[PDB]
Symmetry: D2
Amino acid sequence: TGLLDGKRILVSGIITDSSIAFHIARVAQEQGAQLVLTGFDRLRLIQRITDRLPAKAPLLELDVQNEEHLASLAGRVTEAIGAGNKLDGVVHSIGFMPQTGMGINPFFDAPYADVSKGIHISAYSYASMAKALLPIMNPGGSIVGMDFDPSRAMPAYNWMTVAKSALESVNRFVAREAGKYGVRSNLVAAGPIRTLAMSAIVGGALGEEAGAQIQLLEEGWDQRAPIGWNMKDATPVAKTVCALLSDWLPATTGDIIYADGGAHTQLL
Amino acid sequence: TGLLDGKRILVSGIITDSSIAFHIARVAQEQGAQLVLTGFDRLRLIQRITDRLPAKAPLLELDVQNEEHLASLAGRVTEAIGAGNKLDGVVHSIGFMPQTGMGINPFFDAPYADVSKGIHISAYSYASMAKALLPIMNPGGSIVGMDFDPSRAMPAYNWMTVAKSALESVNRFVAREAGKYGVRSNLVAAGPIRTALGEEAGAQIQLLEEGWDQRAPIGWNMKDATPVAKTVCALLSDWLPATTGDIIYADGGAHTQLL
Amino acid sequence: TGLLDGKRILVSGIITDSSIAFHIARVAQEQGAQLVLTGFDRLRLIQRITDRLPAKAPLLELDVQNEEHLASLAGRVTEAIGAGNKLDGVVHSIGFMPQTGMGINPFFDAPYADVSKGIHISAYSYASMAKALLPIMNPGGSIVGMDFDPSRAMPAYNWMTVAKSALESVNRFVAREAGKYGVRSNLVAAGPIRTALGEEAGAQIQLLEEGWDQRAPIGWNMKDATPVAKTVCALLSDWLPATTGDIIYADGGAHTQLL
Amino acid sequence: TGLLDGKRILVSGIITDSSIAFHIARVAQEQGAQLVLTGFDRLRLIQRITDRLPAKAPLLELDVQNEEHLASLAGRVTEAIGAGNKLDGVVHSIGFMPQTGMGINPFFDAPYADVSKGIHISAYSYASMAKALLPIMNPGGSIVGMDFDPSRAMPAYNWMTVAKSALESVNRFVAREAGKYGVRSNLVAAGPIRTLAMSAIVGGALGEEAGAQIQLLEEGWDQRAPIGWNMKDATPVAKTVCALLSDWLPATTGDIIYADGGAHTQLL
Ligand SMILES: NC(=O)c1ccc[n+]([C@@H]2O[C@H](COP(=O)([O-])OP(=O)(O)OC[C@H]3O[C@@H](n4cnc5c(N)ncnc54)[C@H](O)[C@@H]3O)[C@@H](O)[C@H]2O)c1
Ligand SMILES: NC(=O)c1ccc[n+]([C@@H]2O[C@H](COP(=O)([O-])OP(=O)(O)OC[C@H]3O[C@@H](n4cnc5c(N)ncnc54)[C@H](O)[C@@H]3O)[C@@H](O)[C@H]2O)c1
Ligand SMILES: NC(=O)c1ccc[n+]([C@@H]2O[C@H](COP(=O)([O-])OP(=O)(O)OC[C@H]3O[C@@H](n4cnc5c(N)ncnc54)[C@H](O)[C@@H]3O)[C@@H](O)[C@H]2O)c1
Ligand SMILES: NC(=O)c1ccc[n+]([C@@H]2O[C@H](COP(=O)([O-])OP(=O)(O)OC[C@H]3O[C@@H](n4cnc5c(N)ncnc54)[C@H](O)[C@@H]3O)[C@@H](O)[C@H]2O)c1
Ligand SMILES: CCCCCc1ccc(Oc2ccccc2)c(O)c1
Ligand SMILES: CCCCCc1ccc(Oc2ccccc2)c(O)c1
Ligand SMILES: CCCCCc1ccc(Oc2ccccc2)c(O)c1
Ligand SMILES: CCCCCc1ccc(Oc2ccccc2)c(O)c1
């Protein structure tokens, strides 16, 4: 049978077929998980994408900034999975940061309203999503978010890095809350994955300064990674998340698991 | 002679005489530094307090949330220290967080507008302050801010801990920008210092504070901010010229010990 | 089907039925793995114990200090699993340290020959074991060893903590060598598990152990090694194919919490 | 006056004029510190070198493996500084590792007797040196050793990296011991410094594989370092040690201070 048999897992974050949450959903379903998906803006668009999944699953609207979406989320899920049923897994795979705070723009030229908006979506929403769903979660359940190692600074990532340093702090705190329900909360720190913005800067959407930079950071990842790293394959990352959602890591919470090919453990 | 002779150092954060920034200023002055102090809201009040310092130094108004204070900050400092003169050191010792996101309030009940306000004052202001002053800073200068180890979660500190996780990340980036000026940028992670909440808090804080002194191999006195103020001066000095984007712990070593 | 179906996994470290390696083997077998077990000194004794496992598996002699056991290890495994067959997983669950360098003895009174013996068995043997078996391992295989967070110092554990700081460093290097074979290499940092020393120890261990369960957001039961044995199996499986040279914590989250 | 006025500091580790301990001594003396030096093998040779210091200081023999040198060390120092006088600072700047465990040799081909010998000298000796001198140290005193960030693996450094991971663990423990005497114990994690072996592999003492590698790791250090890093200047490292020996860091022990130009805090 499948890694996640008879587990009901909410997976947010799907926008395209290159999304990390798309492959987290695909694998979860491949491992026999009943899913519940959420989407942010282009619900019609994500309907077309989510239809390309192994199995049919309810799709709810969730704008983590929206105070109404959050207040109503549990009940909507209750309706979708069926009264008397609970969640065994929540996948937070949400991120955002205006151009001002990430990319070619000077680190010091990001206005706070932009940084604030990105932290809200990339860091605080993890707590508010756990606050909504914790109540309708089963003991032994698992909440996992996506992270990008922010231990050290780097070019381009700038204020996103500061948002991810927030998310890791938030995660350890959400573990406190989540423990009172016997639920774990961890983050999967993945190496770079080609999606849209990052698989666009290739040719040079950001210019010759950028491109040739990210193309360097990415490149070095595959060298540093003792088992290597293919930025065009989001499957290994997705499987790590499934391992976190499963029951084979029942004593690990408030933590961070690194799906980056070991790159973060090697200097050169 | 003093550790910081001839150094023009801007020091923010004083509000009372218990303020970590008060002792930083007091020690920097004792070590022969020319200070420029900034205050946030109660300028008259902090005038009373800053008058209790070893030496007289210009007091400017700075509210890190105010876009006008920031844009003008450099020019006003230039006028206080004199045209042609530049700063050798900047002390960010600013911290805030509404009760909603820190204390007895449940962690999940902090509304973002609050959390966001606290991160703006506690984390982002470090970058915006650096962005303002970096241009009027001398090579080999030092920017140092205050921190409280947010590596692990804990009761009460809650969202402040999240704001500090942000500062440390901001600091590594400010080190990048500051490098372009030959300027370092580090954080000093101090143990708790004394500067109502009920029986849970008076139990927790006095239990967390207590265990600090136990864990600390040299011990920890929460009623003395001097050890911390000296660590900030060592950072402002020239005896740590190769360290930037880093964090120096003035905590009695508590953070290196488990029990 | 099981997590580790069709996987040939070598598991060392069993000595009693409380041994973390016993439950690792028990769980790997419950998840349909073909095991090859190794034992150190009391082979007859561990035969009695290994007979208490779900399934029957070959038991080889391995004393990581013995240069002959190491050189022959591959060939003997080849013969047990069959020529042409290779290993998919190696479990290093070996640990030692004389009383001199761990327990009530003062930290400064541990003679090197002792400390060196403990590091040889507890740290270096991880590399020498990897060097022996890596050649008879399949791509996508997994080497996992046991660890106890040595980030911070603590009473009693003393030089074992130093030996574990070494293992973690050894592990990052074994990840390099192992990568050349498409093999991962990680450590599982478990909370204390039950497997005389006087009133100080019975006070400390029961105080350190106790506070573990408090710190742990999901709690921690030192009388149950199963959660730990499952984490080792998740590492041996294929649901963590992108993680190597790393450390997975099976400790109830205790290490992410301060108080 | 000087940073270390009227402080009596033992400084070991001087073998040549490029030694990190040579500059730690030179600066300490420049800051008005009474020194006590120790040497390992070529005492005659180090006599010639130590004579090139700002000021005259007693030179004792200390082979950290030798059980006799350790047992007699305090008394010899007592004699050199004068009965009734104590040390205010100890500088551990000792390292060793046979070619087998560091360089071009395969990581797996280092025999334990070699690794053991290097850990003994590079890690355990820090404890045994503190065990000898702690008794003749003043409250407020400072014990500092030299370290090289071993968080992540790297080429060439191999078993030395494993020795430094040991030393950092040892350091936190020595802090326990050292606290009972009101003495601090920290490590200075420096970036690479041209000495003898490392300033030899330049041309290619280790070959074209090496050289072009270390020359890469070194190079990248100066790029990653936001204030940059000059591998030909050991002065900034020495001054950090003096800051640790001084009284301007009285609340930091069992810790590690990084003198590497910030390189360890930057990814690219
Ligand atoms: N792609 C990578 O290289 C990689 C690596 C490390 C971490 N991550 C993290 O994984 C997560 C998703 O990454 P991805 O690469 O799949 O990105 P993506 O661009 O494919 O998806 C980002 C998601 O955020 C959603 N979103 C934005 N604002 C929202 C809001 N207001 N309310 C609800 N949803 C909102 C978008 O709809 C989108 O699905 C992010 O946290 C990202 O930082 C990605
Ligand atoms: N007190 C402790 O136990 C301790 C321990 C570790 C770190 N710190 C840090 O040191 C710093 C100062 O701490 P403190 O204990 O002296 O606290 P304090 O309350 O005495 O100082 C905090 C300062 O923040 C200033 N401030 C608030 N909003 C501002 C704004 N909008 N613009 C400019 N200034 C503003 C206040 O005027 C005040 O001077 C903080 O960052 C804090 O996190 C304190
Ligand atoms: N027990 C705990 O609380 C706990 C917690 C964290 C980590 N660990 C780690 O797990 C591993 C095993 O722990 P355990 O509690 O099962 O202890 P155990 O005493 O049951 O197992 C230790 C094993 O080391 C073996 N061993 C000793 N010398 C050997 C040698 N020369 N060659 C081959 N094998 C040798 C012994 O035979 C024994 O099986 C150790 O590395 C230990 O550090 C244990
Ligand atoms: N040089 C660097 O790039 C750098 C960077 C980081 C850390 N460090 C550390 O600084 C320390 C010294 O480095 P260095 O570059 O000055 O090296 P060096 O080669 O100049 O000196 C190493 C010292 O070890 C001494 N020594 C060796 N065995 C001894 C023993 N048996 N008993 C007593 N003394 C013994 C030698 O006599 C020598 O002085 C080492 O710990 C080293 O790892 C150096
Ligand atoms: C730009 C630097 C390369 C880092 C890799 C990377 C790529 C995408 C990332 O995720 C984002 C998704 C939406 C908004 C912001 C970020 C990220 O986490 C990490
Ligand atoms: C109640 C929290 C216990 C931790 C000790 C502590 C106390 C005060 C702290 O500083 C603050 C000052 C103003 C606003 C926010 C934070 C802190 O850093 C650390
Ligand atoms: C007494 C130490 C408290 C820590 C808990 C603990 C207990 C046993 C441990 O494992 C050992 C087994 C054999 C030899 C050395 C170590 C350990 O890892 C961790
Ligand atoms: C070889 C890789 C470059 C690392 C920089 C470096 C250079 C010298 C180092 O110190 C040594 C001194 C004596 C014996 C062994 C090591 C080191 O610590 C760190």
